[PDB]
Design an enzyme around this catalytic site. Sequence first.
Site, PDB file in Angstrom:
ATOM      1  N   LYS A  13      48.468  42.502  47.300  1.00 30.14           N
ATOM      2  CA  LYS A  13      48.191  43.441  48.373  1.00 30.14           C
ATOM      3  C   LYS A  13      48.406  42.737  49.738  1.00 30.14           C
ATOM      4  O   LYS A  13      48.656  41.550  49.790  1.00 30.14           O
ATOM      5  CB  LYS A  13      46.769  43.957  48.243  1.00 30.14           C
ATOM      6  CG  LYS A  13      46.476  44.765  46.974  1.00 30.14           C
ATOM      7  CD  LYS A  13      45.028  45.248  47.008  1.00 30.14           C
ATOM      8  CE  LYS A  13      44.732  46.163  45.855  1.00 30.14           C
ATOM      9  NZ  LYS A  13      43.288  46.362  45.715  1.00 30.14           N
ATOM     10  N   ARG A  73      45.361  41.548  33.875  1.00 32.19           N
ATOM     11  CA  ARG A  73      44.064  41.820  34.501  1.00 32.19           C
ATOM     12  C   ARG A  73      43.077  40.694  34.300  1.00 32.19           C
ATOM     13  O   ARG A  73      42.312  40.383  35.217  1.00 32.19           O
ATOM     14  CB  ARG A  73      43.459  43.127  34.012  1.00 32.19           C
ATOM     15  CG  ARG A  73      44.014  44.309  34.765  1.00 32.19           C
ATOM     16  CD  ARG A  73      43.220  45.585  34.512  1.00 32.19           C
ATOM     17  NE  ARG A  73      43.329  46.413  35.701  1.00 32.19           N
ATOM     18  CZ  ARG A  73      42.342  47.044  36.321  1.00 32.19           C
ATOM     19  NH1 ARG A  73      41.087  47.021  35.867  1.00 32.19           N
ATOM     20  NH2 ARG A  73      42.646  47.728  37.424  1.00 32.19           N
ATOM     21  N   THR A 130      37.729  43.249  39.140  1.00 30.67           N
ATOM     22  CA  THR A 130      38.190  43.988  40.304  1.00 30.67           C
ATOM     23  C   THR A 130      37.338  43.674  41.516  1.00 30.67           C
ATOM     24  O   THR A 130      37.865  43.484  42.622  1.00 30.67           O
ATOM     25  CB  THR A 130      38.146  45.511  39.965  1.00 30.67           C
ATOM     26  OG1 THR A 130      39.104  45.743  38.935  1.00 30.67           O
ATOM     27  CG2 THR A 130      38.409  46.390  41.143  1.00 30.67           C
ATOM     28  N   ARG A 151      41.032  36.394  41.778  1.00 32.49           N
ATOM     29  CA  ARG A 151      39.948  36.863  42.632  1.00 32.49           C
ATOM     30  C   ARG A 151      38.737  35.957  42.648  1.00 32.49           C
ATOM     31  O   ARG A 151      38.050  35.853  43.684  1.00 32.49           O
ATOM     32  CB  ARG A 151      39.535  38.261  42.261  1.00 32.49           C
ATOM     33  CG  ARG A 151      40.649  39.253  42.514  1.00 32.49           C
ATOM     34  CD  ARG A 151      40.210  40.616  42.086  1.00 32.49           C
ATOM     35  NE  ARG A 151      41.233  41.633  42.197  1.00 32.49           N
ATOM     36  CZ  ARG A 151      41.662  42.385  41.188  1.00 32.49           C
ATOM     37  NH1 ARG A 151      41.209  42.202  39.969  1.00 32.49           N
ATOM     38  NH2 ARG A 151      42.556  43.345  41.404  1.00 32.49           N
ATOM     39  N   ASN A 177      40.662  42.473  48.030  1.00 30.73           N
ATOM     40  CA  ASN A 177      40.619  41.797  46.733  1.00 30.73           C
ATOM     41  C   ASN A 177      41.977  41.302  46.276  1.00 30.73           C
ATOM     42  O   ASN A 177      42.215  41.107  45.072  1.00 30.73           O
ATOM     43  CB  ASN A 177      39.940  42.688  45.677  1.00 30.73           C
ATOM     44  CG  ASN A 177      40.762  43.873  45.265  1.00 30.73           C
ATOM     45  OD1 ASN A 177      41.695  44.284  45.948  1.00 30.73           O
ATOM     46  ND2 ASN A 177      40.394  44.461  44.147  1.00 30.73           N
ATOM     47  N   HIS A 192      46.438  43.585  42.656  1.00 27.53           N
ATOM     48  CA  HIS A 192      46.221  44.687  41.722  1.00 27.53           C
ATOM     49  C   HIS A 192      47.031  44.519  40.466  1.00 27.53           C
ATOM     50  O   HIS A 192      48.150  44.055  40.499  1.00 27.53           O
ATOM     51  CB  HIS A 192      46.643  45.997  42.383  1.00 27.53           C
ATOM     52  CG  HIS A 192      46.845  47.119  41.425  1.00 27.53           C
ATOM     53  ND1 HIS A 192      45.840  47.903  41.032  1.00 27.53           N
ATOM     54  CD2 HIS A 192      48.005  47.576  40.761  1.00 27.53           C
ATOM     55  CE1 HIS A 192      46.314  48.830  40.175  1.00 27.53           C
ATOM     56  NE2 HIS A 192      47.653  48.627  40.021  1.00 27.53           N
TER      57      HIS A 192
END
Lengths: 141, 138, 140, 147, 136, 140
Positions: free
Chosen positions: A9, A77, A83, A94, A104, A107
């Site tokens: 992001k 993930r 998340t 993260r 964060n 994605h």
Amino acid sequence: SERTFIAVKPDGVQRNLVGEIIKRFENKGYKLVGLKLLQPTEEQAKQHFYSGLVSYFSSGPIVGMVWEGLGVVKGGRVLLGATNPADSLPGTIRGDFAVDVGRNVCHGSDSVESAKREIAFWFKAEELVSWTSHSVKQIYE
Amino acid sequence: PSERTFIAVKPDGVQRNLVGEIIKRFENKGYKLVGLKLLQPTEEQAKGLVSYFSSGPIVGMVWEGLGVVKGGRVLLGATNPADSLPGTIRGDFAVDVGRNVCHGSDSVESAKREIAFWFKAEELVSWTSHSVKQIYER
Amino acid sequence: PSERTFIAVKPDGVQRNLVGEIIKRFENKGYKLVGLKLLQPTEEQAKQHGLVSYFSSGPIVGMVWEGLGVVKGGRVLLGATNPADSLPGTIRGDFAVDVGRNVCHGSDSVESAKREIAFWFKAEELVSWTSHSVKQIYER
Amino acid sequence: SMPSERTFIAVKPDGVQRNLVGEIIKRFENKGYKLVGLKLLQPTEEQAKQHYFYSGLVSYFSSGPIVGMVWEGLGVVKGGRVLLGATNPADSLPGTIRGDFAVDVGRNVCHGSDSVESAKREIAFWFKAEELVSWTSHSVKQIYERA
Amino acid sequence: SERTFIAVKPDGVQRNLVGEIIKRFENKGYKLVGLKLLQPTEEQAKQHYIDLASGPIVGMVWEGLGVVKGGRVLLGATNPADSLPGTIRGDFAVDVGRNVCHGSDSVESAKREIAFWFKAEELVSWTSHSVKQIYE
Amino acid sequence: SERTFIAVKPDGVQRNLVGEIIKRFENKGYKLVGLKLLQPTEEQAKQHGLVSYFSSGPIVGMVWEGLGVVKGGRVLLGATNPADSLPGTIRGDFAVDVGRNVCHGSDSVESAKREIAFWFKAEELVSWTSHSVKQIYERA
């Protein structure tokens, strides 16, 4: 073979985490089959509190990626971490690099169906590259 | 702290250039390297799993330290890479259980057996780390 | 290409936990590990190699690496012999201060590499194998 | 629950001896936390007595230098402890400081305040107010979401 | 036994290079004997200002054989354009005006810089348990 | 606002060096304004044995922006011939053979303009400002 959409992001790109993120997926054994730097348009952000999330997401570039491998949707993930960075464990992207759920860093598609949609949304078919890793027999039985 | 365990980089691990990376993690943790050797298992030593295991070299290692059998396994991560967490060797580097990069003895008894199987007594080196008082309180 | 060199982590290198770091750099470069062994030199072995006493005081890691130009290339990875002259990015440039505690060794020529390999390793201890990455590292 | 929250992190003497100061600081910087105090010091016997086997833990803690740090950020007290890993290294997971670097609970490399109140006390105990530096990270808008 | 002054300038601190810089000195075998996050005092600024006619930063004192020259070799050339990869500035800086760090340029200037930034009681004398592994 | 073209050649992609190469440019302070995975066509490789390898699999094309980035980018890559590359550079650390030298960087400002235009359509480049510009450049 299974594919997922991973994005850095705009906070992740601004904070120089693109190479670090790509490295972790490469190291894991996953195969890069799509990659592109782009600035989402306002319209792309609208499709993806509201004025604020839209504005941040269209404020600067993201790096869109497609990764291929066994269980890569769930596995990708796991590499990203929970998340919400409060719940992310060190060793994950993260857990190592993010504090705030609204910033964060990255994605990853949350399911197979949503991966197919996200890949199709960000990448034209002709932009994905099918190739074979010279290490496939070392990674997979 | 004189407990010992057997760690191996399996052939996929060696092929994928993870020998140094694995050694580094054990050294960083504070464990002491007391045996190390590159070798290609024979078919007989292996005896599909046989063929892969005798197809190329492995690196065999003996590490010493408090709780090193369990601790070494925690560094490797869950045996099945689907369950391995990032930060562990398998969590960071492995996808498929059949190509899970490495091995660690699963108990003290099986460590003693594995060590004896892969290393002659003379090949193990007993020495004292100059950091022992920094790593252990007593 | 089938050229080979002897690299050692000296006892200070082993004590200071640099074995993995050194192996990693050679692996990353594209060189191929064909011998590896932890051992404590005997006083006699140290004689042939104050310097005697330190060298036989604890374990070293002996290694044989294979690749195009690996004798010179291995030394370039190690950095200048005297750490005062070693540049950051090399093993000695990053990790060593004193020439008497310079962490590692690499054969200084092809002839001396053959001698050093033969001295530290018996034939049956070296493994010939083919890296699955050979066509990615070498054009021919 | 403020982004101005602060915690006390220490590299204990074993951590300094084993060259883990930079590595520890890096992990906090990478995470997005802000360094607002930093100081190398050798605890006095008296300071060790207050901090905490009451022969032994005292002697080790006053035997050589520690690095004391104050870090600032949202949820930094809890977050700092997650980075350090479980207090007992047997329970610490790889990826954390103790999971990567420590074996023995008596030589567990570092310390972090266990709550907001104890952080305030620890900061005050190790740092004079004038030693803490207030500044703004040029990355604050990248780390924290603006409404 | 020789000592030098190393600083992470404000751009370095802003760009999260403090840990990375410390790590490289630790890895090299040098010994950390002073460390502090600091803001110049008004009195320090006055004297700096005067002296030029001849924050935050992280101030450090490092000890070791040849550490004044060696520290500078780790930092890389002062002008990042000339810095080689593997050095701090070669890896992390582009512009001479934002060159991330500083190291004393000589033994005499190291003594002066250390004295300027650190009171004697703020330096810690200790022995690394690895001294015999680093020095013959 | 100078720009250069950097590529991870097919060996570099195969050997998992994409992230590592990107990281080094990011760490340095350079700004990523174009990024794309693609498989060169035979025709594209002809213009760039060498043809076959170059069109055999994907490369990663990049455009980087910064003061002196053309020269600086090449300094990060290391000497074109890996035998001459120093540790700390990409080729010094990761390459052995000049025919499998992992990556490419434009050799001048004029050739960067040409290479960027050849591999990237205008709409594929992103103009943006790093929030760290004033920390990396004094005049910014």
